[PDB]
Amino acid sequence: TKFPKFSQALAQDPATRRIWYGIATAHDLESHDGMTEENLYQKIFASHFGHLAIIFLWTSGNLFHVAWQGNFQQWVLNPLKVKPIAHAIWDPHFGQSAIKAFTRGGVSYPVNIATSGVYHWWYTIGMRTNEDLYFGALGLLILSTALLFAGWLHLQPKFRPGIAWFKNNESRLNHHLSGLFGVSSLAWAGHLIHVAIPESRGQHIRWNNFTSTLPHPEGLTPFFTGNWGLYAENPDTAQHIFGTSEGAGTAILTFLGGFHPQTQSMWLTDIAHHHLAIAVVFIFAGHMYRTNWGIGHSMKEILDAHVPPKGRLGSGHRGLFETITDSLHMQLGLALASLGVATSLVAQHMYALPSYAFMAKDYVTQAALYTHHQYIAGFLMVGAFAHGAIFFVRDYDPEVNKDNVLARMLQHKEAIISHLSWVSLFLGFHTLGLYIHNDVCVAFGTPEKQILFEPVFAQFIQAASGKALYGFDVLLSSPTSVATVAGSKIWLPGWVEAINSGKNSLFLTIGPGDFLIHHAIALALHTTTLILVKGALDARGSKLMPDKKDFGYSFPCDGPGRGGTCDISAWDAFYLAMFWMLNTIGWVTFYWHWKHMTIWGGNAAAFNESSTYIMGWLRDYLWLNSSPLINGYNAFGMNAQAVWAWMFLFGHLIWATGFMFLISWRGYWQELIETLVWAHERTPIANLVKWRDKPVALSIVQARLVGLAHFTIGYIFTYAPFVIASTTGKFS
Amino acid sequence: FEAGMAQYNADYPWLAKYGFGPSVKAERWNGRHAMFGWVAILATGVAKSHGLLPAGDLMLTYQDWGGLAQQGFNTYISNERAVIMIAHVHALAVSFAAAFGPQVLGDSLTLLDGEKDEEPYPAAEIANGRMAMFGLISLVCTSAFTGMDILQIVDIGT
Amino acid sequence: SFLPSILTPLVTLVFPGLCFALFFVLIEQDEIA
């Protein structure tokens, strides 16, 4: 009954690696001793309940702290000047100077300035006082309590769901699309139309009077009569001021498009109409699959009979239903890939089409949110590929996938890997070559020789969307175009002015720097996909190790025989692709941050001139914008950014410490620990105190994991202070 | 209720052996501390009446107690708070010496360790402890709901 | 308020120290006979 009760081998392990491996295999429930599928699924269900409880506790904590210690009520009156407060600081290490510097935001105590946009979100959805935030926090706390009770309950004997119920795909998909997506989005549209539009128009609608107050003067009579245009009639005027009745309309569902002029955010009526329409579409979608009545579809039948003629895709999608519904790793990988794509989409769309009031002028929050969601998108994509590899090495059955669409991937994996290698090499060679050419040309005082390629195709797409400065005059940019004529009466009158207005991040102007950095991003994405795809496809075996599936997913090596077999397990292909994930998201965030900093400063010529060469990138972005951060504290004093400076150097330290684990490997440290063991055992007094687990150096995979974690954490903790502190100090 | 004790023990089989949990030793020790705490809040009440505790609007400074003074924060620590906290620190130090130190004399804390048992329930001190702890929970209940403070409630009720 | 002073040390020094002690003792517990 040692600590790794789930692993008898680790329990009998006498060294200190028992603790490490137990901790890191605690959640690998599939490989646990004496584990069954039904128990696995039930334990997963309970852990999901606990996780949801944690999420709602985190949200309730944010709300409570803003309500109690934040200046939400003061910020509501003057959103564009008052700095939002996250929470108070309690630190007995602070000096008087630190307390004075951190006293800010119109409060009498030290505080932290929120950079998450929660103030903007809550103000937009219609929170006006600390009481509303407190009651929301209480509701979320009660929800977390209920979820924890549910997680406890569903592990009970009489309340333990069965494996057939878990594997009921059709009912789950029907409900999680018609209710979880559809009805929830309908509920959000109802919340907007009942509470948010009235609050933006100067009406205090709360639980005590939402029953009495009508969302529309007409009521539901237009809805039941079919005269649904009455709800679009009388939209908000361009002279409207958010939160006040002056210039306010009566429409609840509109398609104006563009942006609200005062807040430079999308119309709440447009957002409500969006959610209503998409809820209708989701509710219709959720009746597809057969559940207990007769109508519907069978996913097994669909997949089985989807096979093209003459065996183009082999046997088609036969057996994919079985593999997907049997293997949880494939489902996890698909979910992670979809969620990573969605996270990239929200990151790309929040800045281009801001939805929350006054967020466009809050430059720190925009950069923080973009960097945050892009990093999480990268993490989710790497996880999706890693779990695909785990599925291949653990849950793939060639007998079931005899000549399947999935098996043909393994059939021509060599071609796939070689072509990924080719495209990666081409992009890298030519992007780096053009960059170095531009560097040398500017270095020799002759910038005229630069190879500057205009992103003609992206500019063409901008023109097709409605941009006019390029002069392409295609589709929506052409006044005569049939597309413009068709859309002229619904959304184009707002969209055209929004896109052509130069004060906005919607379809930013692009140039040779954008061309070059986009091709660098393509290089990085293709190389990350190369590493991950090769890991997934060679996880089962390789010419250097055809029996890799017997060893499994994460093993150290096969020894120095056959020339050396370092980093062969396809867990090491996660490890090696995490570096490229950090690289590509770093390039993306550098690009976003610099192109937005220059535009906020009204100095886009600096980006357009200096972004074409790496010296310009190093000088005008990092070196230039690093001054307010490093000057957070100096010999003469300290500012509110001293915390950010400390963290920049702390992330630097963690990143550098990761290199130790990544470079120096286990034998050196094992011999050193043997010497230390000798010294401890031979010294007097101290030899009375004796360990229980024999100290040993960290395992190979353990130290790869630790070094990668140090690398990643130093990466994020040294870039976040930069992107926040420089943006705060410049305020542009 | 013994069924609930068995359910606990069962669940938490480790904390159980030292007496930590729903145990008679734990109930006795709290009861002792609760009786001492009724005595303590009465002592502070009469001390505040007789202006015993250095008190008033006087507050600490960063130059005398540093970051624990919290000077510049919203919290306004008073010298009466400081001196009562010092008294409680002395109480905690003596208690820690009595607990982790020799069982010089008196009674243990961890069920006398040594695999002793918990003697299920003068020996009326456990009843008094029930009284004292129910009084204390009632006092917090009124201080939270009625919002009528603590020393004021004690004074008006007595 | 005084809740920060009361709670931050309680939850960041006393509780994590007790948690580390409990985890260490539990992982060092040997097999039952």
Binding site: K43, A46, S47, F49, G50, A53, L57, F64, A67, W68, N130, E131, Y134, A137, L138, L141, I142, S144, T145, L148, F149, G151, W152, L155, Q156 | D11, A144, F145, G147 | S1, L3
Partner: peptide
């Protein structure tokens, strides 16, 4: 302005959540 009583009832609900979390953790362990 959030009141001390409001913070206290929120803390009580948090303690209830703590007890339920401990129970859920025990049931997951077994």
């Amino acid at each position: 302005m959030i009141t001390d009583g409001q913070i206290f009832v929120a803390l009580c609900i948090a303690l209830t959540a703590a007890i339920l979390a401990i129970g859920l953790g025990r049931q997951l362990y077994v």
